[PDB]
Design a protein around this ligand. Structure first.
Ligand SMILES: CCCCCCCCCCCCCCCCCC(=O)OC[C@H](CO[C@@H]1O[C@H](CO[C@H]2O[C@H](CO)[C@H](O)[C@H](O)[C@H]2O)[C@H](O)[C@H](O)[C@H]1O)OC(=O)CCCCCCCCCCCCCCCCC
Ligand SMILES: CCCCCCCCCCCCCCCCCC(=O)OC[C@H](CO[C@@H]1O[C@H](CO[C@H]2O[C@H](CO)[C@H](O)[C@H](O)[C@H]2O)[C@H](O)[C@H](O)[C@H]1O)OC(=O)CCCCCCCCCCCCCCCCC
Ligand code: CLA
Ligand code: CLA
Ligand code: CLA
Ligand code: CLA
Ligand code: CLA
Ligand SMILES: CC1=C(/C=C/C(C)=C/C=C/C(C)=C/C=C/C=C(C)/C=C/C=C(C)/C=C/C2=C(C)CCCC2(C)C)C(C)(C)CCC1
Ligand SMILES: CC1=C(/C=C/C(C)=C/C=C/C(C)=C/C=C/C=C(C)/C=C/C=C(C)/C=C/C2=C(C)CCCC2(C)C)C(C)(C)CCC1
Ligand SMILES: CC1=C(/C=C/C(C)=C/C=C/C(C)=C/C=C/C=C(C)/C=C/C=C(C)/C=C/C2=C(C)CCCC2(C)C)C(C)(C)CCC1
Ligand SMILES: CC1=C(/C=C/C(C)=C/C=C/C(C)=C/C=C/C=C(C)/C=C/C=C(C)/C=C/C2=C(C)CCCC2(C)C)C(C)(C)CCC1
Ligand SMILES: CCCCCCCCCCCCCCCCCC(=O)O
Ligand SMILES: [Cl-]
Ligand SMILES: [Cl-]
Ligand SMILES: [Fe+2]
Lengths: 341, 334, 50, 82, 442, 137
């Protein structure tokens, strides 16, 4: 009963916001990541890294503000405030992109803290740690997209910038340059996200429409007691219903709920893997058999060839402005263009 | 013992392995017709002149497509919104060239799926259930109406409806973004929130319940066998689940009422998808996403680009390239 | 019985058969290396390192 | 269902609460206001004023192109306006 | 036994308070009609086309003959002021009656008077209230006829000389025309009732519906539902609401398509060009421009081998080329002078295009119903400059959304009405669970 | 950068005389351009005839030269074709044709100068963007 145990006592007291040992890591880093994003989106430009306005102060709205990535010339610099690029000058730090690494790195350590908090609270309360386990999917996505991806590329510049429209731009980049929609790891992610949304809506709806009548009122919500031992809806009627509507139905509440964990978590892990590939430009860009035929046979056309022409439009039309450091100059006569448009 | 009454009793029988019902009387044929035509077209249909410019697009496996690139191609721009059943063609050869199968499939499928939703009401009534599962399914169904029927109505042609193919789906998405800037449309944003959140809440609920299963099994057997079909006792401890999650955030951010929680699980993705279906359906009438192109300028009047302007550059490259031989005039007004 | 994804837990309290499984894995890996080296030697052209 | 803190609905219906926060809340709003209205926010964060994105006869972006001289590059850009 | 968020459901069996709600709500509808019109008038500027100005009520008034002259030029704004004022005043009268019945009047009506009181399960009384309202509606439709035929007429976009107000002296009575619209296919080149393209048919249809609605109103006051009808329906207030939600939904979808395709009772002079209209107009504009330069537009082969300016439709009709091939079913007063029996007549095209048709095509082309949600006009990649979104896009999108949600409301209340009528809207009786008494499926 | 008198200084006539616009004038001409002209001329192009734009270089080669306040004011009163050979009031908004182009009815002589001034100033600010089309958006 020395100081360590006294501190333990205090960290683990049952207060309105539980702290724990994990709170020491989580709360500063989460606060700082959030604080950095609101600060930058309110006051800080992207003029010197991107050639873009990006704060409310400059005229931007909620959709177009962003904490933009550092300039391609920073490489993968940590861009520490006290480091050799900013040299302690907070203002220069801001203008060089310092807030992006600040947010990304504190965010990373906050996500670790949050997942540790799921472990800590679960241990204290006596539950199994499946929520912590399920949160690994958010972490894998964040690390693969925000850290691994630009680390394989030339710089943090090609990471996503923290903003609504900037992320929209990220999506469109990955189509024109990586053809990401053709990637089977992205497709499994899509199935997991949509599969989970479906499971969510269909399981809630089912429970709400196989309720036992446990009260007299038209509001069925009141007729539940959190401590009652009885299932509040009929798993048997739910199973009959779905067996006869769809052919198959769940029969095991435990598998059902484990399936709901499994599907979106697996989907997100799969897409993270694809993004690791894209860090290396290891794309699912082409089908070789299609290009061989198409090159030899000018009447062969698929939706696959049509989308690559779209991709080529995106690259030539967006690259000068989106990659200013490359000083691309494309004269009018070189831009790919269909007829009239 | 009356012949019509026996048929009626078999139609609505709760003892059939799959429920038929009156909605199913329409659903079974129309879904079979759509499914059979789709399977045959995806394998063996010849190329379809989707954009009416005598530039036929190959969609089927036998004409050099794989699973990812194959599609049943939308019907020709030359047809517009005209009805093109088989019997309106001089020959099946003609019907195939112009994209007839796409029309057959989407109209049978939309009917059969609409009857699918009714069948969900219907069996709920015969089993003594509450009625609103079909309301949840109306979110996906409205979404299929949007891309297969409503968007083609507003643009004037089934040739701009979504292809029945994987890469064709992507083509549709890209061209939609160039013509409508859907990413900047708040109803698509709500749909992303319905779909991301639904996946999130799926995972949350599945992990919280799984976290609080009551010990019923040994280490050497699946915990699933701790639940027996039709047992009356709940299989998990929601108060333990509430005590964990409430401490993870704070107490009043966690449900302790199962009925509210599952209603929320139902409501959130259903409503976000309603909006995203409404998004497609209103961009069918060209009320497009937010346009901040050149919204920021400096004291001289120089444009100061924002990320919206960068988006626009991408959108331009999709616009100038799509359907590259189909435009003769400068504006792509539909 | 055991679910399929737990078949290898029978070794947690059986050090000898854990050692046997670890040897078998080591055998597989070293054998992989031998086979991969040989495939590469059979297909490698050494006539131009430039 | 409680851990000992004063209930929120107790606090913000109380007179002492509003006696204090009818001062602290406007005062912060005003501070934030003045942070921008004085032009301090621009200087602190380095954000270009509407008249200082470009030199007058200039349409090149003042883009940082070096990692270790980046700080000097920006300063060179800022002088090219004064 | 309802929660605050289902609180209006407490009014189901309170006929006097329910009346207050319906009448107060009618007052809100009349208020908005009044107030929105005054707002549109206070902002209106006659030098500009209506569709450059965000107007949707003033164009409805204009279409009825009031305030406009030849070509849609606004001549006199006082009819507009009057419509809004009168609606506005009338909403206080409806507000007064509404709040009086909802707060101070008898909570239920059936004790106070056997005439105004009603029970939802009284199939005879319900059909009498229906029949009364049918009659009102029949009168409603005749008031349109009366305006068209005896009180000034209606705006006719098709009138020779640019459009004008025209009294309608020979409304179409021929049921083969009137009901024939009801039997055209909703598909392209047919368009079901949305294809109605002259005021004679519009007015004759309203004569028919007016009479039919009066006949049917009278029918339903004098009869009770027959036995098949008795056994087919649920007889409850929520079921009746669900039926009307279904109908309003269907009606909203029809209105959406109406405002999108029809340029007769939504004259393009007022509402802007339709999507098809604008697309056709661009092909006209560049056909005109190019022929002025010497292009022989009929023989100009485009890049695909199809005509650049003119091609054939699948049934042979000469039509505009390019992507607008989809839009050849379009008909408009500025284009029809060029149509011969085979479609667009090449000799008229070479010799008889008029300056006013060139103006109109340029205007409609540059006012196509494409625009951003923040009202930047044009294609989605256009820069800021033009502040414009067509009334037709506003009116189509808004009513598609309302139609959609009213279909959802129909499902909600139809399903619930069925379950409450059978006694399980509140859940499954644990002691009498239907499934537990059925044989298992396998 | 800012909207200095030098950028606001534009040729008045083909003789070489010049006139310096106020910022008020410029902003008023931009508003009037949006109200009466942008529906066809957004960004300095011409939607209904892209072969003719409002770039200063193009206006200088028009007959009557239109790269000046007087040329532009006259064009808004009595527009011609690019070679000056035919008057086109019947299909182009102008004061001569305010009967069929009613947005021109309320335009005074000083409005026309502001519109003319805006047209001449804008390529000085935006350069290639003005009249360049989507390629420069
Ligand atoms: C009770 C259950 C009912 C079951 C019955 C089912 C049978 C019908 C199935 C409906 C299919 C609708 C397809 C409409 C396609 C289309 O071309 O429809 C448009 C037509 C109008 O057609 C257009 O009509 C035009 C009329 O204009 C013509 O005439 C005008 C005269 O002013 C102008 O001059 C114009 O230039 C000229 O072209 C032309 O004919 C065009 O060629 C033609 O396309 O609308 C219409 O008939 C009006 C009705 C359309 C409503 C359809 C909307 C569907 C909404 C789906 C709901 C979502 C589901 C929710 C799920 C939960
Ligand atoms: C809690 C926070 C507060 C409550 C917020 C409620 C959440 C929803 C509203 C979001 C907040 C924005 C409202 C105020 C800003 C806005 O909207 O402001 C917009 C205008 C006020 O701004 C004016 O907006 C105008 C829009 O242009 C219109 O006017 C132009 C000039 O005449 C042209 O005519 C153009 O064609 C025409 O479209 C111009 O841009 C004016 O310059 C500008 O003053 O308010 C409007 O119109 C009035 C809005 C009421 C009409 C809304 C009903 C319309 C339904 C159509 C949508 C159907 C749904 C499908 C969508 C998917
Ligand atoms: C040194 C590495 C190592 C070791 C020794 C173990 C050992 C174990 N794991 Mg762990 N595990 C690891 C890495 C490791 N794991 C990694 C990297 C992950 C993340 C993917 C997991 C995720 C994981 C889960 C989720 C579970 C285990 C479980 C178990 C136990 C039973 C496994 C079993 O019977 O599988 C049986 C497996 C099969 C019969 C077939 C699986 C075939 C796989 C999917 C594909 C084939 C791969 C290929 C043949 C060779 C590998 C290539 C490459 C790795 C070199 C056992 C103690 C289980 C447990 O906890 O039980 C209590 C359990 O549920 N593991
Ligand atoms: C339902 C039919 C309907 C339709 C089609 C319109 C359409 C229009 N109105 Mg009107 N309006 C309506 C109802 C309607 N309004 C109502 C009920 C009110 C009372 C609040 C108003 C009050 C009003 C004013 C005060 C003004 C307009 C204006 C306008 C124009 C621009 C609208 C805009 O920019 O929205 C911006 C878009 C939004 C606000 C999107 C909201 C999305 C909602 C919240 C989602 C719906 C959820 C479910 C229903 C447009 C022609 C403006 C105009 O141009 O006047 C001449 C104008 O100033 N309207
Ligand atoms: C058009 C919208 C509308 C209308 C007309 C009504 C009407 C009604 N509601 Mg419903 N309700 C609505 C929306 C509406 N509600 C919504 C959106 C909600 C959810 C927030 C509810 C929730 C709700 C509940 C929970 C209950 C009702 C009840 C009632 C009824 C009794 C009200 C009462 O006793 O309050 C008395 C209220 C007051 C005395 C406060 C003042 C109200 C007045 C009327 C303000 C109007 C001022 C206006 C400017 C007057 C102009 C005066 C001059 C022109 C004459 C009444 C018929 C009650 C009911 O069914 O009883 C069984 C009930 O329990 N409603
Ligand atoms: C459809 C709507 C409706 C309905 C069903 C009722 C029904 C009723 N009201 Mg309410 N009421 C309404 C609207 C409505 N009112 C409105 C709008 C107002 C405000 C003006 C009132 C104010 C009101 C008061 C102050 C009282 C009632 C009372 C009554 C009851 C007796 C009515 C009676 O004997 O009149 C029989 C008929 C007449 C007296 C002659 C009325 C003929 C009218 C004026 C002409 C027809 C108008 C036309 C159809 C539409 C208007 C024109 C417009 C288009 C410009 C009855 C339950 C009484 C009650 O509850 O008892 C305590 C009571 O004291 N009503
Ligand atoms: C708001 C209007 C309205 C409403 C709600 C009702 C409601 C009712 N009517 Mg009344 N009716 C009305 C107007 C209305 N009527 C008018 C104006 C007339 C004069 C013509 C009649 C004439 C009338 C008669 C003669 C009878 C009724 C009867 C009935 C009852 C049975 C309705 C039924 O079974 O429909 C369900 C409809 C069907 C089963 C068949 C409809 C087939 C349609 C035409 C095909 C539609 C296909 C397609 C999906 C829609 C597209 C349009 C299509 C025409 C192309 C019910 C209480 C019956 C009753 O009991 O009277 C005592 C009866 O026999 N009504
Ligand atoms: C970065 C940095 C830092 C930190 C900072 C921080 C910590 C900050 C924070 C900040 C903050 C913390 C901020 C905040 C802000 C907020 C705001 C800005 C909000 C807003 C909101 C709103 C706007 C809302 C509203 C609404 C709407 C709109 C709609 C719906 C409803 C609602 C109500 C939601 C330091 C110092 C370390 C240094 C280094 C750098
Ligand atoms: C007995 C003996 C002997 C013999 C031995 C031998 C003969 C051996 C062999 C061995 C071997 C020869 C082995 C090998 C192995 C192999 C393996 C083990 C493989 C692996 C595989 C895997 C794992 C893969 C996977 C995958 C795939 C398939 C795809 C892609 C991805 C991945 C990579 C994952 C001697 C004489 C010496 C001595 C005496 C005794
Ligand atoms: C029941 C209830 C409710 C509702 C209510 C309602 C809905 C009401 C209505 C009411 C109304 C609906 C009202 C109305 C009123 C109106 C008024 C009061 C008017 C007046 C007018 C005036 C005064 C005019 C004037 C003028 C002239 C003559 C000329 C021009 C200018 C001016 C505008 C100035 C609530 C939910 C809240 C709650 C619960 C119960
Ligand atoms: C005015 C006009 C016109 C005319 C119109 C007309 C003449 C109308 C008609 C209309 C009508 C005449 C309609 C009808 C409709 C009907 C319906 C809408 C139906 C319904 C049905 C249902 C809903 C049923 C159901 C069911 C079943 C099926 C089974 C049993 C049960 C129940 C009952 C549920 C025209 C266009 C010339 C032009 C413009 C103006
Ligand atoms: C694990 C906890 C680590 C948290 C680190 C906190 C960072 C402390 C912020 C203070 C940085 C000030 C440096 C700016 C001045 C340096 C001058 C120089 O470059 O030599
Ligand atoms: Cl394409
Ligand atoms: Cl075209
Ligand atoms: Fe659950």
């Amino acid at each position: 009963r020395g100081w360590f145990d006294i501190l333990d006592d205090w960290l683990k007291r049952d207060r309105f916001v539980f702290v724990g040992w994990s709170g020491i890591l989580l709360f500063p880093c989460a606060y700082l990541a959030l604080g950095g994003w609101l600060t930058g989106t309110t006051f800080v430009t992207s003029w010197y890294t991107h050639g873009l306005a990006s704060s409310y102060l400059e005229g931007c709205n909620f959709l177009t503000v962003a904490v933009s990535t550092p300039a391609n010339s920073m490489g993968h610099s940590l861009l520490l405030l006290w480091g050799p690029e900013a040299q302690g000058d907070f203002t220069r730090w801001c203008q060089l992109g310092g807030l992006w690494t600040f947010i990304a790195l504190h965010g990373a350590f906050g996500l670790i803290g949050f997942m540790l908090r799921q472990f800590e609270i679960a241990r204290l309360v006596g539950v199994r740690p499946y929520n912590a386990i399920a949160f690994s999917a958010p972490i894998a996505v964040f690390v693969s997209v925000f850290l691994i991806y630009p680390l394989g590329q030339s710089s943090w510049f090609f990471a996503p910038s923290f903003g609504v429209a900037a992320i929209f731009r990220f999506l469109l980049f990955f189509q024109g340059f990586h053809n990401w929609t053709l990637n089977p790891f992205h497709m499994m992610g899509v199935a997991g996200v949509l599969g989970g949304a479906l499971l969510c809506a269909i399981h809630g709806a089912t429970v709400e429409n196989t309720l036992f009548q446990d009260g007299e009122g038209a509001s069925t919500f009141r007729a539940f007691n959190p401590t009652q031992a009885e299932e509040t809806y009929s798993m048997v009627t739910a199973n009959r219903f779905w067996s006869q509507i769809f052919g198959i139905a769940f029969s095991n509440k435990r598998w059902l709920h484990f399936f709901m964990l499994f599907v979106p978590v697996t989907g997100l892990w799969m897409s993270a893997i694809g993004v690791v590939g894209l860090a290396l430009n290891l794309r699912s860009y082409d089908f070789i058999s299609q290009e061989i035929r198409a090159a030899e046979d000018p009447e062969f056309e698929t939706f696959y060839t049509k989308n690559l022409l779209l991709n080529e439009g995106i690259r030539a039309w967006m690259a000068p402005q989106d990659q200013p450091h490359e000083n691309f100059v494309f004269p009018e006569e070189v831009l790919p263009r269909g007829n009239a448009l | 013992a009356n012949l019509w009454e026996r048929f009626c009793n078999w139609v609505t029988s709760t003892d059939n392995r799959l429920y038929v019902g009156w909605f199913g009387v329409i659903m079974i044929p129309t879904l079979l017709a759509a499914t059979i035509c789709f399977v045959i077209a995806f394998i063996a249909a010849p190329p379809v002149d989707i954009d009416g410019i005598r530039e036929p697009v190959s969609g089927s496996l036998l004409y050099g497509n794989n699973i990812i690139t194959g599609a049943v191609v939308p019907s020709s721009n030359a047809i517009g919104l005209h009805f093109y059943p088989i019997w309106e063609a001089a020959s099946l050869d003609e019907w195939l060239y112009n994209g007839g199968p796409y029309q057959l499939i989407i109209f049978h499928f939309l009917l059969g799926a609409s009857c699918y939703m009714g069948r969900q009401w219907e069996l709920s009534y015969r089993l003594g259930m509450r009625p609103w599962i079909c309301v949840a399914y109306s979110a996906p169904l409205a979404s299929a109406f949007a891309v297969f029927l409503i968007y083609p109505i507003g643009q004037g042609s089934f040739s701009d409806g979504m292809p029945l193919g994987i890469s064709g789906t992507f083509n549709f998405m890209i061209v939609f973004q160039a013509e409508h800037n859907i990413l900047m449309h708040p109803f698509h944003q709500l749909g992303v929130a319905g779909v991301f959140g639904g996946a999130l809440f799926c995972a949350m609920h599945g992990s919280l319940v799984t976290s609080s299963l009551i010990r019923e099994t040994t280490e050497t057997e699946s915990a699933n066998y701790g639940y027996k079909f039709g047992q009356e006792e709940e299989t998990y401890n929601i108060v333990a689940a509430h005590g964990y999650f409430g401490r993870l955030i704070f107490q009043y951010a966690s449900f302790n009422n199962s009925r509210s929680l599952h209603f929320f699980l139902a409501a959130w993705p259903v409503v976000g998808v309603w909006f995203t279906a409404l998004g497609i359906s209103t961009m069918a009438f060209n009320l497009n996403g937010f346009n901040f192109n050149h919204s920021v300028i400096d004291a001289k009047g120089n444009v100061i680009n924002t990320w919206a302007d960068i988006i626009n550059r991408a959108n331009l490259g999709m616009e100038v390239m799509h359907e590259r031989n189909a435009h003769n005039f400068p504006l792509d007004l539909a | 019985g055991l679910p399929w994804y737990r078949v290898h837990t029978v070794l947690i309290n059986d050090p000898g058969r854990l050692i046997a499984a670890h040897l078998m894995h080591t055998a597989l890996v070293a054998g992989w290396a031998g086979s991969m080296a040989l495939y590469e030697l059979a297909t490698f052209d050494p006539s131009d390192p430039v | 269902g409680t851990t000992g803190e004063r209930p929120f609905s107790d606090i913000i219906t109380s007179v002492r609460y509003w006696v204090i926060h009818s001062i602290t809340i406007p005062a912060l709003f005003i501070a934030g206001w003045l942070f921008v209205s004085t032009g301090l926010a621009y200087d602190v964060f380095g954000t270009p004023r509407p008249d200082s994105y470009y030199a007058q006869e200039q349409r090149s972006i003042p883009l940082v192109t070096d990692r270790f001289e980046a700080k000097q590059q920006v300063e060179t850009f800022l002088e090219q306006l004064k | 036994g309802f929660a605050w968020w289902a609180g209006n459901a407490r009014l189901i069996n309170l006929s006097g308070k329910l009346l207050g709600a319906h009448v107060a709500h009618a007052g809100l509808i009349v208020f908005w009609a009044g107030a929105m019109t005054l707002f549109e008038l206070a902002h209106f500027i006659p030098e500009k086309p209506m569709y450059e100005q965000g107007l949707i009520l003033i164009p409805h008034i204009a279409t009825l003959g009031w305030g406009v002259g030849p070509g849609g030029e606004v001549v006199d704004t006082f009819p507009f002021f009057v419509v809004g004022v009168v609606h506005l005043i009338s909403s206080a009268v409806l507000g007064f009656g509404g709040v009086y019945h909802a707060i101070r009047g008898p909570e239920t009506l059936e004790e106070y008077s056997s005439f105004f009181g009603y029970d939802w399960k009284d199939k005879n009384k319900m059909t009498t209230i229906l029949g009364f309202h049918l009659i009102v509606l029949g009168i409603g439709a005749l008031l349109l006829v009366a305006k068209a035929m005896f009180f000034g007429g209606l705006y006719d976009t098709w009138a020779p000389g640019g459009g004008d107000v025209r009294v309608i002296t020979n409304p179409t009575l021929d049921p083969r025309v009137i009901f024939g619209y009801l039997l055209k296919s909703p598909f392209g080149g047919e368009g079901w009732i949305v294809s109605v393209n002259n005021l004679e048919d519009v007015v004759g249809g309203h004569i028919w519906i007016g009479l039919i609605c009066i006949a049917g109103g009278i029918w339903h006051i004098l009869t009770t539902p027959f036995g098949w009808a008795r056994r087919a329906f649920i007889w409850s207030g929520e079921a009746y609401l669900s039926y009307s939600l279904g109908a309003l939904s269907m009606m909203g979808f029809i209105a959406t398509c109406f405002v999108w395709f029809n340029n007769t009772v939504y004259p393009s002079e007022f509402y802007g060009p339709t999507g098809p209209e604008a697309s056709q107009a661009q092909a006209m504009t560049f056909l005109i421009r190019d022929q002025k330069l010497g292009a022989n537009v009929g023989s100009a082969q485009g890049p695909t081998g199809l005509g650049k300016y003119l091609m054939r439709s699948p049934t042979g009709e000469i039509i505009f080329g390019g992507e607008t091939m989809r839009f050849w079913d379009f008909r408009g007063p500025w284009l029809e002078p060029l149509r011969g029996p085979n479609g667009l007549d090449l000799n008229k095209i070479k010799n008889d295009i008029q300056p006013w048709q060139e103006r109109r095509a340029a205007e409609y082309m540059t006012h196509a119903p494409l625009g951003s949600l923040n009202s930047v006009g044009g294609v989605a990649t256009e820069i800021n400059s033009v502040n414009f979104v067509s009334p037709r896009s506003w009116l189509a999108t808004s009513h598609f959304v309302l139609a959609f949600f009213f279909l959802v409301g129909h499902l909600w209340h139809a399903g619930r009405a069925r379950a409450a009528a059978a006694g399980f809207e509140k859940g499954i009786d644990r002691e009498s669970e239907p499934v537990l008494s059925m044989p298992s499926l396998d | 950068a800012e909207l200095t008198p030098e950028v606001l200084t534009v040729p008045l006539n083909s003789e070489g005389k010049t006139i310096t616009l106020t910022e008020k004038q410029y902003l008023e001409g931009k508003r009037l351009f949006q109200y009466a002209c942008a529906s066809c001329h957004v960004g300095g192009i011409t939607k209904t005839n892209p072969s003719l734009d409002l770039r200063t270089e193009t206006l200088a080669l028009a007959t009557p030269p239109r790269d000046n306040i007087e040329g532009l004011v006259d064009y808004m009163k009595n527009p011609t074709t690019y070679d000056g050979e035919q008057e086109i009031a019947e299909v182009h908004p102008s004061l001569r044709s305010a009967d069929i182009f009613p947005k021109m009815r309320n335009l005074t002589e000083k409005d026309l100068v502001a519109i003319a001034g805006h047209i001449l100033v804008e390529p000085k600010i935006l350069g290639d963007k003005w009249g360049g089309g989507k390629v420069y958006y």
